[PDB]
Design a protein around this nucleic acid. Structure first.
Ligand SMILES: Nc1ncnc2c1ncn2[C@@H]1O[C@H](COP(=O)(O)OP(=O)(O)O)[C@@H](O)[C@H]1O
Ligand SMILES: Nc1ncnc2c1ncn2[C@@H]1O[C@H](COP(=O)(O)OP(=O)(O)O)[C@@H](O)[C@H]1O
Ligand code: BEF
Ligand code: BEF
Ligand SMILES: [Mg+2]
Ligand SMILES: [Mg+2]
Lengths: 417, 495, 417, 207
RNA sequence: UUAAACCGGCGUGUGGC
């Protein structure tokens, strides 16, 4: 059956299921290797397996169906996709495909997908006759995505502050500029939880690049939705692989008129990997970055856009500063001008155990009038007018005190009265 | 192993004539030709050595065709179930993996294919060095002459060819002479000869004029069209944008100097300089000059034009091989018709009032009413099957019996046009001497008479190939039939 | 037929037209790839296609006819131009050429232009016998280009203020010095709209370099005229390509005695691209800019000039400050001395929600007496005399209040009375 | 070179024009080279001056490396060990004589060929010739002609090549040319020399 | 011009009949 159906559960149920299948000792091999052996035996029972995965296209023309729980990486259960399907339907990268698969005969490699039964949770007829992603008409954020939870938690403020600092909507391009040891982890955690709880209609796609495996395990089983990540366990090759794969999945899902939130941390390590995997042009820039090292990062960053026809792609990629060297800062610079949504976090206030320390001054949103109603916009303008003339510490303590003294944001408006 | 091949592809001098991609496709072909020697089974083997990433991995091509000889490369039109091929053509397999690696004869094949590939790259280079003038007059000496083409040299190893249709039928050639034509087609990826010059194709004259006439080239006299007959006769219709320009005496020159120079450069080719008109009727009138036509009948749908010259000038108007007409039929691209000499050669007033035998019973409830009406024409008989009542009033006395007789005669006209059509489509006529032949039914006789023979004597003098592609007979029954025909006609010795 | 004739319309009409042509599924390939396939089929019908485009000359000697709607970039419908045309007419870069084209035979690349029928909207005879651009005699702005709309909109002031701060005319060289988040976008928008509405005689050529694709879509279908842009989707190579191509098109159009307005934003990103694409001279300047990195930017900037014989080229390139680093400021410096027209915008007043915040003090025009009549010049001198001795906030609030209290500029003169 | 180049050279200049294009292999190349060099040797023996303008020396070195026996080893770039002996002989055949006659060769060196061996030739040829002249392509692509490298050009014992005060003025002129940039020096050269007609007129205009 | 097929001379010594 489905691989993810065997993947949601730990290795223990896989071991007892393999014992039901009557095979060699399963616990010895890896759990994904266990799944490979188990699907091989299930196919030996004389039935066609039903598999699913997102497509990865190599130079040869065939495809691989990378699974969600395998972090969109190379695995023994990556379904081989013959080029004939790419000739008939021309399924591009990121297309979630589900269909019938057969076992690999000897001297082969993996399972082969015979016939597609589901293309991106839709009929296969829509796959061939469809308007493409880079072919769309990009626009600004029209619909507002509220962030406050509504029951008044302590980190619920961490969402409210955004709704009070700069709104966030569909199709936006958001940056999180923060130094190390500032509070980005818990911030994106409660951001994802609030998006999932208050707006369960949109597709939450949290992303993690080069962090601690404990952080990956804390992120996967805390938030709603798919959690694909690539820690330092994988080199720049697998980093760029998972990055382009999730971005193409988001492109296809927006092509199918659906909203995709991509919370990525951090963009600077992604840029480092990109600069690592670019050919040398015989010259270096300021900080130690190749010339063409920014083209593909800029493509990946600008993939986010709001569409006239349907769907949206909103990415929130965290920028890292205070690294001591120049190149990272260079990345940050090359990224302030491309994104139309900035959000800056404070470490000088975070060291004072003052959370959340968001830079209310340099935060902002372009075309933010489309992100909030009329009189709420007037009141936010007046509130920023009040926040401006006071000091940094003044504004921040006023924020934290008077918002913890409140429960929700409109209640905050009605209390400022 | 693979690092050695990487060193070779790094050490190739002509990295620009043959970059990495052409190098590893050449090694694809080399390993294919090597596998031709490894196994006695002649199988095409792509190996996609993946130059940049890794090394070779052997495949096997199916060569989709209904045959089965050398089954390593035989697949029918739909054998694509197994392995999830699901492709009729182009589906190829990867059965044998990691065949014999590089050995000395493999290196020999690679060496010879890469040196001939460097030669092909130099051929592309000479293509580029001869190009950029496609459609211009070029000088060139010839090397060899053949019955189908001739070779030409310009210098700097510039090799080209002029085909048989590109030459004049009577232009004598000899090595060393400096012949001139125009470079018309280029094949930068061909196998044999690369560049192609011509002397008979129409547009040549254009650039001839473009190098002769100072008017053309700045487009004061726009060349409209031109038809040609190689070395024999070429007509050309031109149009001028200015009004004080006379194309009859400006393109010709001073008492036949420009057109005469062009004809002498072409090698004695008659040229007819004609003014182009925006009306096809007046255009075909002016095209057949020297000639005069007082009988014009143009039909848009049939693409035909009844352009009949006056009686007496025929031997000059049609000319040898119908050139003056044939070129005309190539100038506009239409068909013509010249048949009458004396009996009402107007072909318009004639067919307008020559119907005394057709309308013998049309308004024949009482013939003493009125003659047939030519104002509407009564000359189509099929589009006349339905005319509105807007113009059906002018005929006085159109009672209801009269229009019923009209409908009856229209049914008669449909019958007679269907009869004329079935006699016109029946240009086979399988006679009883063609049907009574054993093994030749009605349909086989239909087809056999459609082949081009309608009698029985000429049947015995065609072979198996001449009968081949027949509808309803195999080659052996074909041979038996033609043998029986030769027995009835030649071996029987009967008359 | 014409490519732009198939390009003004979306991909939907192209799809149904290809279905009329009876080809493979068109929606699968790109819409410009759709146009390529459609023109291939149209040529298969036995007719000579009529194409047009501006010329791009490579080292080999042949040319490419880049189309307007393709942002003057590489495309499958770029008409190949044989060197024989460059031998006969010697069409230089930027020459808008229209003529007969043929389909590409196999093993070829693109369509080939047989015979030119239109050279820069003129007869081909004027192409060979013509005086060149760098061969002209540069002069100052003689004719004044008024900016006010005339019906009194809120952003109509944004034009009036220019006519009140420093006039703009044909052949001028204008700079817009402004920090990020200041109001340059809407400013150049209403500037282009006012130039188009009030002065429809001149050729409006708005330019955009490295901005958001949503901004490109908002600019293309809002203003009158051709809108060629190159966002961050293209590296420095395509940036410099489109820049030199539009500048050569403007050069040719001025050679044909026509006026060309080039509104570019921003010049600093163009300078960054130029510094990225210059060979290293083994030394760096203050800020991180190569030595010869300014030569070609200076050429592109000084291409603008007013001509004695006919036509004008007026560029308004926006300069960016407050970027934190030096090199950008360096660019700004190297650009204050070459342009003869400065215009400075305020962000310290823009953060106060006070728009439009133009620096009335450091704005100015050289030889501005040729840009306005006598008594209007006297009145502008007296008005600047009045504006000078008051504070910055004073001058700016006086400006905005008393000009929104007015409708047109001469009405403003008659109200100050 | 190109045969069209040979035809343009033969019937444009004064004197004998012997050439060997790519139509001839390395054998005929070395043949014509040694033959013209021996003709020059004999003409200098007869106390006569011979100017030998050769282009290029790198293709001659390639031919020489093609026609040398293999010594079982290769150098950096792909050149045999003894492949330079005969080229060095042909290059050093030029000399000024006490008794009579002179042999002055101007052989063009080719760089920017992508590979090493040609550059190697260039190196092996900077130390043997006592007269260098360097031309610029980075300025030639700017349509700025003639683009001669004024910096790395020079002549050994150049005091015997020009009078006293003209030498002082050339020293001061190179002093002026030095501290400015490459583009600066080159545009100054081309502009102010096209603004002049002759060289002593140029000295009298710089005044 | 192109295609197909095929592609011990001499002395010496020994031994035997
Ligand atoms: N909203 C918050 N409330 C309380 N503590 C916080 C909050 N955000 C961050 N912190 C503190 O920050 C620390 C983790 O910061 P981290 O997310 O690692 O910052 P960074 O991502 O910049 O390294 C935790 O020890 C936590 O105490
Ligand atoms: N005249 C105006 N009226 C109302 N809002 C304005 C006006 N000018 C600027 N703004 C506000 O200021 C912002 C300016 O954005 P933008 O033009 O992108 O600035 P910049 O060009 O400096 O990046 C807009 O989001 C808009 O809401
Ligand atoms: F320490 Be932080 F996550 F960069
Ligand atoms: F347009 Be903003 F100043 F990035
Ligand atoms: Mg963190
Ligand atoms: Mg802006």
């Amino acid at each position: 059956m489905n691989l993810t159906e065997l993947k949601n559960t730990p290795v223990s149920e896989l071991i007892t299921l393999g014992e039901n299948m009557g095979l060699e000792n399963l616990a010895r091999m890896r759990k994904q290797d266990i799944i490979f052996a188990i699907l091989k035996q299930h196919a030996k029972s004389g039935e066609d397996i039903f598999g699913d995965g997102v497509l990865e296209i190599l130079q040869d023309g065939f495809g691989f169906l990378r699974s969600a729980d395998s972090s969109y990486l190379a695995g023994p259960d990556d379904i081989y996709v013959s080029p004939s399907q790419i000739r008939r339907f021309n399924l591009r990268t990121g297309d979630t495909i589900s269909g019938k698969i057969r076992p690999p005969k000897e001297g082969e490699r993996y399972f082969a997908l015979l016939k597609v039964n589901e293309v991106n949770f839709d009929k296969p007829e829509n796959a061939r006759n469809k308007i493409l992603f880079e072919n769309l008409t990009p626009l600004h954020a029209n619909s507002r995505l509220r962030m406050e939870r509504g029951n008044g938690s302590t980190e619920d403020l961490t969402a409210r502050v955004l709704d009070l600092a700069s709104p966030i909507g569909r199709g936006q391009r958001g940056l999180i500029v923060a130094p190390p040891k500032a509070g980005k982890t818990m911030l994106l955690q409660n951001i994802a939880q609030s998006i999932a709880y208050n707006h369960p209609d949109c597709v939450l796609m949290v992303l993690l690049i080069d962090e601690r495996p404990e952080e990956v395990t804390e992120m996967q089983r805390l938030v709603k939705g798919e959690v694909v990540a690539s820690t330092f366990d994988e080199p720049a090759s697998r980093h760029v692989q998972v990055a382009e794969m999730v971005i193409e999945k988001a492109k296809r899902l927006v092509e199918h008129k659906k909203d995709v939130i991509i919370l990525l941390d951090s963009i600077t390590r992604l840029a480092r990997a990109y600069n690592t995997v670019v050919p040398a042009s015989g010259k270096v820039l300021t900080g130690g970055v190749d010339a063409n090292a920014l083209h593909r990062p800029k493509r990946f960053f600008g993939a986010a856009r709001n569409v006239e026809e349907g769907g949206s792609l909103t990415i929130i990629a965290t920028a890292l500063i205070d690294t001591g060297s120049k190149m990272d800062e260079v990345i940050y610079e090359e990224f302030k001008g491309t994104g139309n949504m900035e959000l800056h976090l404070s470490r000088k206030i975070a060291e004072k155990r003052v959370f959340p320390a968001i830079d209310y001054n340099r935060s902002g949103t372009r075309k933010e009038e489309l992100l909030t109603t009329q009189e709420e916009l007037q009141k936010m303008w007046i509130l920023r007018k009040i926040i401006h003339p006071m000091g940094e510490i003044d504004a921040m303590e006023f924020l934290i005190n008077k918002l913890a003294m409140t429960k929700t944001n409109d209640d905050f408006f009605e209390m400022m009265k | 192993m693979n690092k050695e091949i990487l060193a070779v592809v790094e050490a190739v001098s002509n990295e620009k004539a043959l970059p990495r991609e052409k190098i590893f496709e050449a090694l694809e072909s080399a390993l294919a030709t090597a596998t031709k020697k490894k196994y006695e089974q002649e199988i095409d083997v792509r190996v996609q050595i993946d130059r940049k990433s890794g090394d070779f991995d052997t495949f096997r091509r199916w060569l989709v065709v209904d045959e089965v000889t050398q089954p390593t490369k035989e697949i029918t039109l739909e054998a694509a179930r197994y392995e999830d091929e699901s492709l009729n053509l182009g589906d190829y397999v990867e059965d044998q993996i990691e065949s014999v690696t590089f050995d000395r004869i493999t290196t020999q094949t690679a060496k010879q294919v890469i040196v001939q590939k460097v030669r092909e790259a130099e051929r592309a280079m000479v293509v580029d060095q001869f190009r950029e003038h496609e459609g211009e007059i070029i000088t060139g000496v010839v090397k060899k002459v053949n019955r189908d083409n001739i070779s030409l040299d310009l210098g700097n190893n510039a090799e080209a060819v002029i085909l048989r249709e590109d030459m004049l039928p009577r232009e004598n050639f000899r090595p060393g002479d400096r012949v001139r034509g125009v470079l018309y087609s280029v094949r930068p990826e061909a196998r044999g000869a690369q560049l192609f010059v011509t002397r008979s194709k129409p547009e040549m004259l254009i650039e001839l004029f473009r190098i002769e006439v100072p008017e053309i080239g700045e487009e004061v006299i726009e060349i409209k069209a031109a038809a040609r007959d190689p070395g024999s006769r070429a007509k050309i219709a031109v149009k001028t944008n200015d009004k004080r320009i006379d194309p009859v005496g400006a393109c010709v020159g001073m008492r036949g100097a420009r057109v005469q120079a062009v004809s002498t450069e072409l090698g004695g080719e008659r040229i007819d300089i004609v003014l182009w008109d925006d009306n096809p009727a007046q255009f075909v009138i002016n095209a057949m000059a020297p000639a005069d036509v007082a009988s014009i009948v143009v039909d848009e749908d049939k693409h035909t034009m009844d352009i009949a010259v006056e009686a007496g000038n025929l031997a000059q108007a049609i000319g040898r091989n119908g050139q003056n007409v044939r070129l005309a039929s190539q100038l506009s691209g239409w068909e013509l018709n010249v048949m009458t000499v004396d009996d009402l050669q107007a072909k318009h007033q004639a067919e307008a009032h020559a119907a005394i035998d057709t309308f013998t019973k049309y308004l024949d409830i009482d013939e003493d009413f009125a003659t047939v009406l030519v104002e509407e024409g009564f000359s189509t008989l099929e589009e006349l099957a339905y005319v509105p009542m807007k113009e059906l009033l002018e005929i006085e006395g159109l009672d209801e019996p009269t229009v019923e007789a009209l409908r009856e005669r229209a049914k008669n006209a449909l019958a007679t046009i269907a009869q004329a059509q079935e006699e016109s489509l029946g240009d086979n006529k399988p006679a009883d001497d063609l049907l009574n032949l054993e093994g030749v039914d009605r349909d086989l006789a239909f087809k056999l008479a459609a082949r081009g023979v309608c009698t029985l004597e000429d049947l015995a003098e065609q072979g198996i190939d001449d009968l081949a592609d027949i509808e309803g007979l195999t080659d052996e029954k074909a041979g038996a039939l033609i043998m029986a025909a030769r027995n009835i006609c030649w071996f029987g010795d009967e008359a």
